[PDB]
Amino acid sequence: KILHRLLQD
Amino acid sequence: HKILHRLLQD
């Protein structure tokens, strides 16, 4: 879920 | 030489 992390930072 | 060749020519 790295993509999920980068999608809200 | 392939089957597709024959079917396309007939």
Place this chain on the structure above:
Amino acid sequence: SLALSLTADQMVSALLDAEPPILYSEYFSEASMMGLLTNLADRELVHMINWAKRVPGFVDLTLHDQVHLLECAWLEILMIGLVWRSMEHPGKLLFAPNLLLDRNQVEGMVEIFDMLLATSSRFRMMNLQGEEFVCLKSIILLNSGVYTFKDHIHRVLDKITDTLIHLMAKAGLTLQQQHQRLAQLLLILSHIRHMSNKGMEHLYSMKCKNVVPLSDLLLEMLDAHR
């Protein structure tokens, strides 16, 4: 080339008249399921090749170009045909009139099955017409392998684009609705391409499994993608 001199209505009539018939299944485990679907696919392939010849502009190409196009698009054409006749059967795929199947029923497949169902649902949502379907199918034939070889094919594709717009204008759609619907239709081909590639990879594993009887024709068309 006769294809470019054809009018829009004459283009539709040519495509409609060239439509391949609906075949029946030879009438469930995972060995019999695959055996039936591949048997059906091999027989439909034979009709597709004869349908390809009747597609305006396809005869004007060299034999080798015809081979390249058919090798590249055969599974897409099978799939869009399967999706088309499954429109009036939500949640089900009509492989044959005596073979209407569940997503319940052997994988590999469930991913592709749901994608095929999703496409069928999209067509139904768009109320895809028969005249529009035959245009899309021909487009797949000429477009799928054109970037792996040019002017002739692209001009025939332009002709079908005109034919699609012609159909939408006849249906009474506005100018905005025409290019919007044209977009919605052609974007679906991207998904159909995706499904074919997933279906081709699965077909390779079936060959390597050496359980399901595959015809030499179906094997030769499979080798072309490898």
Place this chain on the structure above:
Amino acid sequence: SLALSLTADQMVSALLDAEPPILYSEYDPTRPFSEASMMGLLTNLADRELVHMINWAKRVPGFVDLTLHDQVHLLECAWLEILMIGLVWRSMEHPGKLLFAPNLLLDRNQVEGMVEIFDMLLATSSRFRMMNLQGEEFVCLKSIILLNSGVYTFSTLKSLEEKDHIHRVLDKITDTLIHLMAKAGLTLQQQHQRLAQLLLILSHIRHMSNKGMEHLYSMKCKNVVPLSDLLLEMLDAHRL
């Protein structure tokens, strides 16, 4: 949603503004390159571009209106497509060559059966050059790939509205494309044809992406070329 309220010109400016930067490779023309070291440069380059892509996606009109889950899905589906069309675009003015980076301009001879994909990428670039693709058209296509590639794989009445919202944005982008071609002096017939020609190329881009994804899986199993955690994470998302 403000995406449905943007004019064609406002849609274009929003997309041009959001454009990711062109990154440089750590390629060194002195240092020799094995087929795995060269591949390592590209995968490293793809990794850094992905991060910029993600922040680019956020600025794409309509994308931030979607749920976080839907955003992840669309990006997991179209990430290699978006990379490839970007590569193809900046390679337009370099015939027979692919400009992976300003300091990394390769031809088909420079390796390992990735060559088929390399040729398709060249043919796509050649197609754009022949069609004289414009930057305003390019950014539209790229946004279309983002929203369209994963929309056919997303159950409820509520989810229904999200997919309908996506198509509504797609229509606006279609409108934007038509507006551009109309301003270019093209007749209605020429507009519809060019629109068709552009969208058909996306079918080919999907094809190259599926092929490339297959190789990326093989490289992982080979365990020679280094791959980032994010890249492996995007890769496994497709192999499922």
